[PDB]
């Protein structure tokens, strides 16, 4: 989900970079590779030409690209009455979990199960999503939203009787 | 959220600019870099050639790019009866907050909490949004709108009785 920026600290008449996917560049600051993927991993090589036209030995850097978990699922106790605890969970495995509220509130947990207290800022109805963080710090695409419906509590419709009964 | 305009005040037969992301230009007025991002930060270098073909020493300028806060959240007392104060708040942290009314009215606060008096031009129902301004003057993407519903006040449905009661 990141980019790859290549650069050199030296000074040259010309720079000549080469790498994976045909990466080609002639600058001390090559155009940044964006949305790097597995095919952008590999060895990037740089050689230079001096102020008097003499070439250098080449040097190189290994760049790898780490992957995120796949899109996780979400399940919640969605038919919920106001005042009841709201419980959300995923079967997904990761190092940490990111939970996103319908209004953008963003919290995290160390485990696959999250609970929301009725008095907190997260007790929101609507579409909730989750993403998973792995050990490399790579974050999965967000899950398909799970709708949560928080219902109101009705009145008592106070009942009567038929008056005194013989 | 800004652009980067490079320029020089001098006169030359030719100009030769270079910089981050492979920025390249041959003008006293290079094409303006728009929507500058972190990768556009760095040192831009300029050298020139004189009217008689002699080159110059190069000079350079450091340009940095500041970041905005992330998308903030919004919570409001949305089930509101007309005449009651309308209260909006965010958990977001910044130097100032920008609140945007459904009809485009635009106001600001020094803190995370805003209130609207029923008689002001902001007592509007509909979708409200917020953005956050940090110390660098950089402004976050607007929040997901929070709908506000301002309800009317019903009549009394004047009640009767069953006439004189023995």
Q: Which residues of B92-115 are buried (b: 16+ CB within 10 A; e: fewer)?
A: bebeebbbbbeeeeeeebeebebe
CB contact under 8 A, B19 and A29: yes
Mutating which of B70, B144, B145, B147 best tests the A interface, going by the most A Cβ atoms within 10 A? B144
Structure tokens at B110: 């020094």
**From CA A51, how far away is CA B131, in angstroms rounded?**
51
- According to DSSP, residue A71 is labeled P
CB contact under 8 A, A31 and B18: no
Backbone angles phi, psi at B51, to 5 degrees: -70, -15
- According to DSSP, residue A57 is labeled -
**From CA A36, how far away is CA B120, in angstroms rounded?**
51
Sheet-wide strand order for A86-89: A75-76, A86-89, A113-116
Handedness of CA B19, B22, B27, B33 (dihedral sign): negative
With left for phi above 0 and alpha for psi between -120 and 50, is residue B39 left, alpha or beta?
alpha
First to last CA, chain B: 80
CA angle B145, B151, B157 (to 5 degrees): 165
- The neighbour count for residue B134, using CB atoms within 10 Å, is 16
Mutating which of A3, A8, A12, A29 best tests the B interface, going by the most B Cβ atoms within 10 A? A29
- Listing DSSP states for chain B in one string gives ---B--------SEEEEE-GGG-EE-SSSPPPB-S--GGG-EEEEEEEE-TTS-B---EEEEE--PPPPPPPP-EE--EEEBTBPEEEE-----SEEEEE-TTS-EEEESSSEEEE-TTSTT---EEEEEEEE-TTS-BPPPPPPEEEEEE-----------SS--
Mutating which of A103, A120, A127 best tests the B interface, going by the most B Cβ atoms within 10 A? A103
Which residues 25-54 of B are in CB contact (within 8 Å) with A? 39, 42
Q: Closest partner residue to A31 among B18, B22, B146, by Cβ? A: B22
Residue A158 burial (C-beta neighbours within 10 Å; 0-12, 13-18, 19+): exposed
Whether residue B67 contacts residue B37, with contact meaning beta carbons closer than 8 Å, is answered with: no
CB contact under 8 A, A3 and B75: no
Whether residue A97 contacts residue A109, with contact meaning beta carbons closer than 8 Å, is answered with: yes
Backbone angles phi, psi at B22, to 5 degrees: 85, 15
Q: How far is CA A22 from CA A29, A32, A41, A116, B59, in A?
A: 17, 14, 12, 50, 33
CA angle B22, B26, B27 (to 5 degrees): 125
Nearest residue on chain A to B19, judged by CA atoms?
A29
Question: Number of Cβ pairs closer than 8 Å across A and B?
Answer: 39
Handedness of CA A39, A45, A46, A47 (dihedral sign): negative
Interface check for B144 against chain A (CB to CB < 8 A): the answer is yes
Residues with Cβ within 8 Å of residue B14, at least 6 apart in sequence: B26, B48, B49
Method used to determine the 3D structure: cryo-EM
- Shortest CA distance to B60 belongs to which of A26, A11, A17? A11
Instruction: Give me the resolution in angstroms, 1 decimal.
Output: 3.8
Instruction: Specify the 3-state DSSP secondary structure of A40.
Output: helix
Interface check for B91 against chain A (CB to CB < 8 A): the answer is yes
CA angle A82, A84, A90 (to 5 degrees): 115
- Shortest CA distance to A51 belongs to which of B96, B55, B87, B135? B55
Radius of gyration of chain A (CA): 28
Structure tokens at B43: 């040192």
Structure tokens at A73: 């699922």
């Amino acid at each position: 989900g990141d980019d790859i920026a290549l650069s050199t600290s030296t000074v040259a008449s010309s720079y000549d970079w080469s790498g994976p996917n045909g990466f080609t560049s002639n600058a001390q600051n090559p155009v940044v590779i964006t949305n790097a993927t597995g095919s952008n991993a590999g060895v990037y090589t740089l050689s230079i030409v001096d102020g008097n036209g003499c070439s250098s030995a080449d040097t190189s850097v290994q760049v790898t690209v780490n992957a995120a978990p796949t899109q996780p699922s979400m399940t919640t106790n969605s038919p919920i009455c106001n005042g009841a605890d709201l419980v959300m969970s995923t079967s997904a495995v990761g190092n940490s979990y990111i939970w996103r509220a319908p209004n953008g509130a963003d919290t995290t947990t160390a485990s696959s199960t999250l609970t929301i207290v009725p008095t907190s800022s997260l007790y929101q109805s609507g579409n909730w999503t989750l993403s998973v963080v792995n050990a490399a710090g790579c974050v999965s695409p967000a899950s398909i939203a799970s709708a949560v419906e928080i219902n109101s509590i009705p009145s008592t419709a106070s009942a009567g009787n038929n008056g005194p009964v013989c």
